[PDB]
Design a protein around this ligand. Structure first.
Ligand SMILES: O=P(O)(O)OC[C@H]1C[C@H](OP(=O)(O)OP(=O)(O)O)[C@H](O)[C@@H]1O
Ligand SMILES: O=P(O)(O)OC[C@H]1C[C@H](OP(=O)(O)OP(=O)(O)O)[C@H](O)[C@@H]1O
Ligand SMILES: *CC(=O)CC[C@H](N)C(=O)O
Ligand SMILES: *CC(=O)CC[C@H](N)C(=O)O
Ligand SMILES: *CC(=O)CC[C@H](N)C(=O)O
Ligand SMILES: [Mn+2]
Ligand SMILES: [Mn+2]
Ligand SMILES: [Mn+2]
Ligand SMILES: [Mn+2]
Ligand SMILES: [Mn+2]
Ligand SMILES: [Mn+2]
Lengths: 492, 492, 492, 492
């Protein structure tokens, strides 16, 4: 999911629309934009679909104001109903709207809490709504008008104590300003930037990824430190504060492997370089373990793996060819909701340039293998076009565990690598060879960019969840609810 | 406007729909229904338009639960925007949704209060929204979870203490139940009824008029006493309490003159009888004041005046003839949003049976004349139809004052009787005679059915406003804010 | 169904909208408006729903031009799909659009013809589309540009030879003008009028009923003679001609009994007077056959029967009371598509003013009894409100045969009077007494207005179809297809 | 634009959808699919928007039949109105629906003709509609029911005799079958293919590009020869005939340069190879004309140029780096309707990986420069990204002439190369160098794949129009009628 916050001095609507467009790749299921207008009212527009379908001129005109927040959704909890599209809103205290990229591992627990203790009403099954509500009640502890930044920070500190999981949030509190914060583990991405308008008036903005800053002409300030909350007043005064007891930098690794745009710099790590470094480490592993292999061409599975593949072609000193033509009107299958929708998407998204495979042993390279969805079809395609032999290198290690921090992997059994050896997976997808990046490698691939990061968040790879609290019983519940069939039945 | 609220054991959506349909005459502008499903979640559906347009199968299937409220709107505050369609909802404390028929006379005073003081957010210009928030802020003064009936009532009384104006309201508090209250003056209509299901389960509903009970097969209980608050818990328990300091019954006289449906009984008064009664008084008045006149036929201006005219035709021993054909597909032109719309709607609404007027002295009868839209056009028609002489009789006294209790009449200058003597009004519409029911006759016509009512809310007639908080500055205020030009301008 | 044609000198769109509004009572299922603009292009807008829902300002603005035709649909053939909404259009020869009030009894036959012989393509199951196509092919016999009025007339004469049934049509032929014609039996209504704009420019218009002329300020010229076609050029030149070999005046009788608005004059017969005359004859029959009967009040079943009832009250010298309050947001149940929709409509459309029935023997009067739909519920209602005894007088004779001329009565078995004695019908609806108008009476009731009419079209009453060609095998097919269940299954 | 037509034994809707999806790059403005159901009725669904937006399950379930055609539009005539969305249909003779990819250069001449002469009605300003009507009017010259293959061909030849311009068309004649023809010059692409089902039933499809065959699992047959007409009957028979006087293959060169998808083979030419070939020629040109230059990296401007650039990077022995990230959710900015839309779309479409440009001399490569929209913005980005020197190379020759064959380039003044020497263009976009592929190189680059093609339709390049009916007055005409300001003005 992508969230954007802009506490500016001019109409932010097109700028947010534009921001969500570059972040569109983080959520294609719905999009929402909420602004505050001159009459301190919230102007909202959210619905299922792409940013380009969701907002029409008619909406844009209604979306007035100079401060606003937006969100593109990739459903990881609840349902695919437009009622779970973000932002969310609570009319008190003050009027708060919030966008969240993450996932609360203790949502059910906080739910009992909210009704019985806090007296708030959660109408959807979205954990982001819960989040906004935990925040809301915490904030509801400071009655004297007005809320002080210390109070806001104090509320988020309290929230940090209650909630568990991963979250990059952005919110607006009417008559107050824009608030943004990052979980105590720095799991989900969030960067702060600014655009100095004129000598004395500076606009600020937070976003999941820096590309949004770039595309809008905002300067990079830095990443919102883990556990740190930011607070920009309606008057333009920036406030900051560590709101976690033991803040630590454990960035999501999948963000580098696949999620983020290559042109973003997450925690001082150019996703682009990390991905190139991934190409280096993987091509090195291939050279070392597949040194006998006869390869005629190195073909990337668009779009994510390309540079990774490009680097691998260079390392192996083999040619890099765009054997697969991507349909520019089909999105990312992986972040699509249903497996059948994704499974089919793969055949409508890619088509071989037959000449590139005929009488050729090709090495197909992809950023990662998750459900197996892509690799399965891709290889057949490669074959049908005359590939003599097809090997597959994965820029990411086998993915054997559920993601509970903002990526839809609730069912381990849905992952192809689950309970399977590399060789079995190879046999399933029908590749002559299949090789996986080594975790320790991938880690250096990323770390090389910022050694300060000691440990990443890579549960989907090693099952060690940083927030600690994630256990087998939770994972069980989670699968019972979010497995593909349970989801389908919910889709009626 | 019309509100309904059903707390029962069966799904209420259809019942609420059918109720809104029979109360549709109270608000053709918008309709809303919100229910509580078994998950204790709100299911809402509200938008601009008639009940038949607003609700379709797709919507009905979504409106699950056995408890829900409904609303048909005739804007009297804010704007025509569907965002001000009702009901309104706030998620804390507990989750409350409310529908209001009336108008608060101290909105401005409360808007400022709600923010700086009670920390709530009002996103519209609707007083109904403000009203929900006072109840909420009052309700938010209790935390001993769960709310006891007493606290609800305590919030309502604290609410009445705060608000001024007319209001018949119904709401739902997630986890507690349905509540319904009436203003300390009993201006806006509200009745309670039940539907025993078995040995214990008895269904409860509230609605602006008893016709909604009739159609729904609900047993009539009584009018919700002025200032009373009704509270049906989720478990089915009915609690009532007087929440006004010194309540008094001052029913809106206009409900009888025109607003309500004749098959309704308001404050133990039958609108049908009250209307015939008006015709008796009007007939007797015509019999003495115009005695020396020659009338060939008595023609009602459909549809509200029909019975009145039938009865008048009775008094005078003259033929009642349905000289005017009303278009089944044109609603109440009176309650339409703009004067230009209403005017065009009158030629569409009615057409003359030339036979019934030619070479005859006709007596047109109408429940009332307000802006003079209908009468001005009706007379031109009678003439065109070959009518010798056209006389008009309004079952109602001259309307010279603005209504600030939930009836759209903000600008006294838009009322034809304003600044005019009967004869001036006669000349404008072009009648050869024009007679108005006297005020003391109207009141006696309605009281004849329930003498306990000592005084009626009849400010539109006598400029007397029971809430004693209405004044010239306030009236001028309304006039400016909502005059047809102000509204028409605002719509663009 | 209602059709309107206006060959005018100014924007006709609002005028047509207004025309369809007064004719709305002839078809509530869909509406369509097609104009010709300055660029001799057809501007069309048609869809299911009421005239008021179908056309929005956005449509109105697109509906430019000074010549146009409109239609309100009451489905009697095909399906209820918006694709069968009229007008219809064929791009050649010239560009022709047509609206039809009627029904072709030989549609299936003309269908084979059209493909094989005429080479035209019928895409819907509407006989009106077929009609337009038979016309189109006939017209396609005159190649030399341009078509002469003699040719147009000749085409319609040919059409009159081919097609069978009832039809009032209106069409526009691009670059040519507006054409209108009536079947050779004068079954369906159609009147011609005009509005002289300025010394030399006269606008013309045809319509199902004169009220449309009235409402628009058009002067009545006369009824389009049976078999006669009219042709108004784009230049304003009116042409006329008898286009049938044996033209005869056999007006639809149901039009007087129930279909048309009382304020219309069909074939020099004021529907209003015919209906009053119906009240006379029926009250006379009641006085003569129910002379012992003890009646306390005469109550009409709104809307159609009122004047009929009013007259009956006068004849019996009993009071006329509006015991039933009609919901002004529910239309005519009878012309509604499905029996369950109609059956229920009856309970949402009418509600007793209880006081009017309590301890009273009431005589309920309705224009007609068809399926029994209304009478059934009405009586229960009358009872539930305390009617001691309830009698029912029908302004129309028992209706025992299918209508194949423009009214949806394809299944005789759906008529309550089918194969039943008056007494059985009385027992079914549960009335203490039930009396039917005598055909011969009804005929004089109507004839009295225009003795020139020797014979009416009243097959639904006496099963003698004027077009002759209607036989049992056709009737059988017709029922197999249009019976309520076959229709329902078609509604999927 | 892209057209598809499938005559098969299975329902074609999904297949047509998937085909339109892979041909979506040929027209993002509108999409249309019309089928023939078992009742020999047309089922259409066309509207403005992408394939994914235009068609939803509701629509697909309605598009029944085994034969249907489809169309994805990029307006080049008329307006952007959905009424000019394709396919178009006429009901006589027999019922024909047609989809056209191209542009007729003698529209005006035919509009007058069709009315006064052939008595047909054109309701839009689309030449495709006019085209359908000529075929129709020609087809309407036969009456010996049914039409023999020969008559169809006879109508097509008579049609070609009448029309001028480029056109790849596909149509369906109710009761006969699918027909497809290509202009006498073979300008617009069209290929035929099949899908044998069993011993006899073989499915047939036509489509602007072979990729549509590939994705659909259809066997490639051949390109529809210039002037040829393909006719598949309803019973499955395939007839072909040359319907042009003196046909000749003059394929649209621009289809290879940019328009078509690389995995397509047009006129036995692979777009992928043609493009690499362009890169070889461009690479060799850069190698000689700029030899004394220092380039650090070669960066394609995604997405059309990618392979070209890869290959150029090959020629020069320089790194190919995906310096530019393209937004997956922004289509071909080139084919967007207005210059203001395209411009905003470029900043959205692309973003620079700062790493790849900083302190480097970059070589940007693009399939072409037309209005200069992309290049002007791309260069600013490279600079901003820290780039020392920014050089640009267009795989295509300077574009100085309007395309009148189905590519929106009406105003030569809107083409940057117009009235300019390379260097002037270099200065405008702000490159430190700008080189264009020579024309003779382009042609040789494409011909290298099918030397039989002697000449290409390349008027945009050399002002030479094979139809020899295009002239200055005609070009000036276009310019005036459709210049961005004319169009933008018209849209309002
Ligand atoms: O094994 P799977 O479950 O298919 O998951 C991994 C696939 C899917 C995803 O690609 P997309 O999200 O389809 O697209 P893109 O690479 O363009 O971001 C990812 O980059 C790998 O290719
Ligand atoms: O026996 P039935 O099949 O019910 O048919 C006859 C009824 C229905 C129809 O009334 P509506 O069409 O419902 O309404 P209105 O009288 O207002 O035109 C007609 O006037 C009789 O009342
Ligand atoms: C994409 C993402 O971060 C999910 C947000 C929240 N968990 C949800 O919408 O379920
Ligand atoms: C209402 C009417 O005349 C029907 C017209 C035609 N038969 C149809 O729509 O079926
Ligand atoms: C995209 C194309 O071929 C345009 C065809 C036709 N002229 C149109 O639809 O505008
Ligand atoms: Mn991928
Ligand atoms: Mn397999
Ligand atoms: Mn009235
Ligand atoms: Mn009736
Ligand atoms: Mn019964
Ligand atoms: Mn490009």
């Amino acid at each position: 999911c992508g969230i954007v916050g802009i506490a500016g001095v001019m109409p932010v609507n097109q700028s947010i629309y534009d921001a969500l467009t570059v972040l569109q790749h983080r959520g294609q299921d719905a999009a929402g934009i909420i602004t505050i207008d001159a009459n301190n009212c919230f102007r909202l527009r959210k619905a299922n679909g792409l940013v380009s379908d969701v907002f029409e001129a008619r909406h844009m005109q209604r979306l007035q104001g100079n401060m606003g927040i937006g969100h593109v959704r990739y459903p990881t909890a609840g349902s695919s109903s437009a009622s779970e599209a973000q932002p969310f809103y609570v009319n008190s205290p003050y009027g708060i709207t919030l966008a969240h990229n993450g996932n609360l591992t203790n949502a059910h627990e906080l739910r009992k809490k909210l009704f019985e203790e806090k007296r708030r009403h959660i109408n959807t099954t979205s954990d982001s709504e819960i989040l906004l509500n935990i925040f809301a009640s915490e904030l509801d502890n400071f009655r004297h008008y007005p809320l002080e930044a210390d109070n806001i920070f104090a509320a988020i500190a309290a929230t940090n104590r209650l909630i568990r999981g991963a979250y990059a949030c952005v919110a607006m509190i009417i008559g107050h300003g824009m608030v943004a914060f990052r979980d105590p583990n720095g799991i989900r991405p969030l960067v702060l930037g600014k655009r100095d308008i004129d000598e004395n008036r500076t606009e600020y903005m937070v976003a999941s990824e820096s590309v949004a800053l770039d595309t809008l002409g905002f300067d990079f300030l830095r990443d919102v430190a883990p556990g740190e909350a930011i607070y920009i007043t309606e008057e333009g005064q920036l406030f900051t504060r560590q709101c976690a007891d033991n803040p630590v930098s454990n960035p999501c690794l999948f963000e580098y492997v696949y999620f983020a745009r290559p042109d973003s710099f997450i925690d001082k790590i150019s996703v682009y370089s990390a991905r190139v470094n991934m190409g280096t480490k993987l091509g090195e592993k291939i050279a070392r373990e597949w040194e006998d292999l006869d390869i005629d061409v190195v073909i990337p599975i668009p779009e994510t793996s390309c540079d990774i593949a490009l680097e691998i072609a260079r390392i192996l000193g083999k040619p890099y060819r765009q054997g697969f033509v991507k349909n520019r009107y089909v999105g990312r299958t992986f972040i699509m909701p249903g497996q059948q929708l994704r499974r089919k998407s793969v055949r409508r998204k890619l088509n071989a340039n037959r000449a590139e495979f005929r009488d050729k042993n090709v090495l197909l390279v992809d950023d990662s293998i998750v459900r197996g969805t892509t690799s399965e079809q891709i290889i057949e395609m490669a074959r049908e076009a005359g590939a003599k032999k097809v090997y597959l290198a994965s820029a990411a290690p086998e993915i054997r565990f559920p993601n509970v921090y903002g990526i839809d992997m609730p069912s381990a059994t849905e992952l192809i690598a689950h309970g399977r050896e590399v060789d079995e997976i190879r046999q399933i997808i029908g590749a002559d060879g299949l090789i996986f990046q080594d975790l320790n490698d991938l880690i250096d691939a990323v770390r090389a960019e910022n050694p300060d990061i000691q440990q990443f968040e890579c549960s989907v790879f090693n099952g060690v969840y940083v927030t600690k609290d994630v256990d087998q019983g939770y994972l069980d519940f989670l699968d019972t609810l979010r497995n593909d069939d349970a989801k389908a039945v919910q889709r009626q």
